[PDB]
Design a protein around this nucleic acid. Sequence first.
RNA 1: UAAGCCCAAUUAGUGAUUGCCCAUUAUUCCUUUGGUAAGGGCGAGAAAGUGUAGCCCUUCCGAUGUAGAUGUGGCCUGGAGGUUAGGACGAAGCUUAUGGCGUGAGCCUAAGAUGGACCGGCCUCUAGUGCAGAUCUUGGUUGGCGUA
RNA 2: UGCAAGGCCGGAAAGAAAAGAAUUAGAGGCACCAAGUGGGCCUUCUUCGGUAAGCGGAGCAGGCGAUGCGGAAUGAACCGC
RNA 3: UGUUGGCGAUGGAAAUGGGGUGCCCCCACCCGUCUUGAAACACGGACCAAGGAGUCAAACAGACGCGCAAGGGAGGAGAUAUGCCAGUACUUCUCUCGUACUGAAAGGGAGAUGCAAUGCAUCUGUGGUGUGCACACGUCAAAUCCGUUUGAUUUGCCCAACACC
Lengths: 196, 123, 66, 144, 54, 120, 227
Amino acid sequence: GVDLTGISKKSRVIRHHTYSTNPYIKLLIKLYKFLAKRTSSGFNKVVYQRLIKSRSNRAPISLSRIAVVMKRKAVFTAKSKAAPIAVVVGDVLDDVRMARIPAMRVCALRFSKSARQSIVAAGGECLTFDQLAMIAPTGKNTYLLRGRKSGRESVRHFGASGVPGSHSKPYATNRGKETKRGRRTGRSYKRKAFRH
Amino acid sequence: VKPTVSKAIVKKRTKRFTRHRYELFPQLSSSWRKPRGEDSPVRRRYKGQKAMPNKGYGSDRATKYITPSGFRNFPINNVEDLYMLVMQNRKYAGVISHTVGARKRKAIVRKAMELDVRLANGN
Amino acid sequence: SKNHTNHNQSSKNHRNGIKGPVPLHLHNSKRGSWLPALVNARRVRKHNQKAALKKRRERIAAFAAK
Amino acid sequence: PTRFKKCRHQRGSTFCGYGRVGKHRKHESGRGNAGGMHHHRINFDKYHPGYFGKLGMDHYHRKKNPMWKPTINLNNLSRLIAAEEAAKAAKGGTLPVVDLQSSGYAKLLGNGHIQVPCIVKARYVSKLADKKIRKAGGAVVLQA
Amino acid sequence: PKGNNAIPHVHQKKHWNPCSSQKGNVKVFLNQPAQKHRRRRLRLLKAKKVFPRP
Amino acid sequence: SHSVDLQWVLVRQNSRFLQKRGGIRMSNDPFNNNGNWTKRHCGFLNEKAAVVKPAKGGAICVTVKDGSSNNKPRQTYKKTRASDVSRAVAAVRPDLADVSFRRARRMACIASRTAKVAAA
Amino acid sequence: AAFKQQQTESFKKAVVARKAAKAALKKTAYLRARKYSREYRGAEKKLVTLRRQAASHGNYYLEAKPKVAVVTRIRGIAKVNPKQRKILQLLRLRQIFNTVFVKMNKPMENMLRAVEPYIAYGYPSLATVRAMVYKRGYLKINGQRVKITDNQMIKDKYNNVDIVCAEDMVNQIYTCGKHFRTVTHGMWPFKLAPPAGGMRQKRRHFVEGGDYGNRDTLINRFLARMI
RNA sequence: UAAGCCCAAUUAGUGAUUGCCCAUUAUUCCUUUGGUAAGGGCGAGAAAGUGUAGCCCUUCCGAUGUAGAUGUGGCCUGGAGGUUAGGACGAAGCUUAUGGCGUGAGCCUAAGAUGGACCGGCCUCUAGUGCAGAUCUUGGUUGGCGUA
RNA sequence: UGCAAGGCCGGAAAGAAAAGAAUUAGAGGCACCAAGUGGGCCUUCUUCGGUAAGCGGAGCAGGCGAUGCGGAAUGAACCGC
RNA sequence: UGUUGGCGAUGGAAAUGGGGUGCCCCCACCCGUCUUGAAACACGGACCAAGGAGUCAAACAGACGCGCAAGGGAGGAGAUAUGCCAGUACUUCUCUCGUACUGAAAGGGAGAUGCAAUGCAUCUGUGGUGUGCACACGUCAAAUCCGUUUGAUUUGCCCAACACC
Ligand SMILES: [K+]
Ligand SMILES: [K+]
Ligand SMILES: [Mg+2]
Ligand SMILES: [Mg+2]
Ligand SMILES: [Mg+2]
Ligand SMILES: [Mg+2]
Ligand SMILES: [Mg+2]
Ligand SMILES: [Mg+2]
Ligand SMILES: [Mg+2]
Ligand SMILES: [Mg+2]
Ligand SMILES: [Mg+2]
Ligand SMILES: [Mg+2]
Ligand SMILES: [Mg+2]
Ligand SMILES: [Mg+2]
Ligand SMILES: [Mg+2]
Ligand SMILES: [Mg+2]
Ligand code: NA
Ligand code: NA
Ligand code: NA
Ligand code: NA
Ligand code: NA
Ligand code: NA
Ligand code: NA
């Protein structure tokens, strides 16, 4: 007997294989597992790790955010070097709040019809990951991007709404029903909006 | 045809795992059921009781599924089934299904003799 | 029908350990402190933000020009 | 599908995931939302603050059609213009015309930066929206 | 142990379900395609009868 | 447009050529030289293929899929010592040389044994 | 065939370099072993002369305090207090008849004093250290337990010009060198057999006629029946 | 003249070291199974691979458990969409000192000196889908007993 | 141009010596969803009530419950594991 | 990794594994249950066959699969292939959830930078700071088949995210 108390609490929960039913996703995973195994770059390892994730953990990104971060990188870059390739493991959606964008090369798993049209009209190219594996087999001169996760309604619902310092929404279908007692000082009390 | 040689087969255990106390009741079958009684002696692992199946009783993977003749069994139903066995001669033997009739059994046995494919229940 | 004991409680508390405190540089809010100093601190922070914006603009212009 | 349920995994285990000590019994806490003030008070008070009480005036015969009033923003105004007219648009000359009440909107709000000058016909407008569109180069015309 | 769920208002506390003691109060739509076919056939017949009037 | 990798992903689990009896997976494919259910030997979906078959008398016939007339099912396969057979196969598919060599030897031995039992 | 030719040329170039590295490591190990043997003999002789010089004049000689201890666990894993459990876990004695080397300073002596009914310990000798490294020495390579079989593994594991052979490890452990912690942390805990011939009483101190506690340099005979 | 009590030894004042008996413990060897796993490859043999009859080879560590949770190219039953097959030269059902395979749930062959018309495997879909006990329900039987 | 507060700029750095001068089968942090349980009992030390008790009430830790195996001839909890 | 004998010459053989029954030595309290505690002088328990217990609907939530995305999607109904076909193919208008919240209510309603103090001017743009993947530029170790790897760190921009404003 060996004393190994609390040794199962060190185990980590990882995924290691995909639950997706998409044959094209399986083909992409087949390519990038090989690349991550046989290549020394960290770009391939990160991309392979993100292809295995679930749909909820691959949030969509926006064309306006792509344009803004690319410009902020470009202001401090030599005038003779070429702009990088924006890479997102996810979907690229359009923005009606930004009308004119530069010419960029973007690679993604999926494009909206409007996003594709906007990019090509501005003068760029929409690439696929098998094309990227042939342009940049190691990922040199790329910009790896992620989409936004907070601001989702589920995240804003997480928590208990009636403890001090808590600003999460309750689960309720009638908006005018849960006000009053515990939410106004005129009633018994009001839960405190701040706590150290 | 002769089979490919392998290591000796060991067979950790030969006796079967039978249910607790099935010898006293005619209606109980002998197939294994896991005992879940709170006071069960078999479940509590007393010294003189019968054993329960584990993963430790598993058999060596080099010789798993190999029959005493040295082959492995592949079920066949007609003459055309032998043509996909004709190439893995020394690995697999064919087992004619129970419901194939005498008329077809004659043809299957003749063809297997011509092709040099071993039959586990031939003739 | 009413009994009280502290027998298993230490073991239960240490199963997932006693977690240590948060470092003092995190959650370092200033709400509820002395208002006269709080107001002056706010003014200084505003000036600092303006200065940071100006410094970045100067850096950009220098890089572009040379 | 019945073949994916937990009861198929539990054939042979007597208690079905409810225990030998505290069994599975009919209604061990009451029926429905009973006890929200006595023995379910912690649940109610910590997850649903504000369930009990009264607040405000009444309105005996509410009709929503007279209260209809949807809104749209300046940086969103480009959804209501076609692509060709948007390309043809330019401040100082001939501008496209947008009819909010025909597109399904009533009030124009002023969040953001306007991406194209135009003439907007709206039932309502806000101070900032009016000022911003006038500065951009368009105009807003009240309709009914 | 009711955690953080909504407060339910499902409204099903009258004898709507038909059982050995209750007639029920339900309405199903299993005759929807048959009735649609019947309506169309009637309209075609009526147009044929009143021809040439619209 | 639709590649062999995609097709293999599509048919790996159910096909009319996959025989799963007992716990063993074999292949009914007439263009398989082995019987194994793998992408290398699945000759009905590969772009190029070659299979060794027994012919009348003691002849050995090699059937070759060149890869140019695919999408024309009536022109997909045109017919044609063990070293000679292996050299014939290696023109189309180098990774099918050893199995074709062994298959030619086995076909010759089967023919000889059949002639023996015919004389007897 | 260009790729195959390049591969075989590179392999033919690599084999000879491996042979040369083996040849060099052998000579380095030989030289270090010879010098260590000379140092041990010189130290012993110097102590002998000093003791004789004091004894002739009628004074006394005080010896340098021991610097290294060897600790083994003699009780199993059952009914242990939380504090002593944690001390044994920190000392890496989680099974019965596990053995380690520790520094005999104040922070470690005050730890050994608190788990006394569970351990036996003492001061090892060169023969004991050598036997425990050569017979039952294993390393931590990629988190695995690997037996020591040549000097190349030692060199690769430690990556330090002061530790390239097994005699380096023995010297560091025996003399409490500057790399004592590195050498002992890079090893798996020693797993020994029960003592042939038996124990005395695991429930009493060695002074009372039992087994646990500090037994000075008499631990060597105890370990010689376990290694 | 202990086979009792209190001390003390290990073959006895002869000279280095351990009298001997018994564990689901320790050390070591073989096999299985799982990893927060670690490396290598791509005359019979090799599939770029979570899970199989595991793609192939090497290596290290753990393995009990009531209430409870989860996983399984894990087993079984009635029906539906497909695919591949069997049967008057004998289907389903039934019998067993009929063996073989699987840790197991179970699967498969043999014999019937049984039967006389239907039915198997694989991939999906579906449900009134697995029994030893509820003073369980219905039908049959039984010791007491050739007794009172 | 002293003290307080927030920043920018530049420098040093046995990155923690020597004096018994740590050690680690030593990856830190953050969330979401849900079960069973809510009759306990024994022992070592510490104890309050009670004449006492295989009695009632507590503090610290270890056990049984949920667990066999090797010993005390036998024993839930003792000794070893 | 070879060497020397026995049995085995095609049988009603020999051998090796299974299976069946008896015997010897050793081991071994009766199941299910509730209970702190059951082998219990604690309840249920003569035998066999067939039957026999987490299911259907509806509201909400979290995780996972799929389609589209600042939009998504009906439903009811119609039209004609259509007169085998309760299916499949097609559809204007509308409706609903979302893109904006807040107040008891009358009501109001969210960009940045610079200059000034319902102000004015520009519009390729993270409101700022701290900690922060990958990529780019330098530097230093270890190992090396000498081609490169495995590590560390400096600076630029920092994506997601968290803390303070
Ligand atoms: K068996
Ligand atoms: K209680
Ligand atoms: Mg938002
Ligand atoms: Mg029981
Ligand atoms: Mg009032
Ligand atoms: Mg509760
Ligand atoms: Mg709870
Ligand atoms: Mg009635
Ligand atoms: Mg003893
Ligand atoms: Mg277990
Ligand atoms: Mg259980
Ligand atoms: Mg049915
Ligand atoms: Mg029998
Ligand atoms: Mg049922
Ligand atoms: Mg209990
Ligand atoms: Mg909202
Ligand atoms: Na029990
Ligand atoms: Na309960
Ligand atoms: Na039954
Ligand atoms: Na409970
Ligand atoms: Na209870
Ligand atoms: Na019960
Ligand atoms: Na019992």
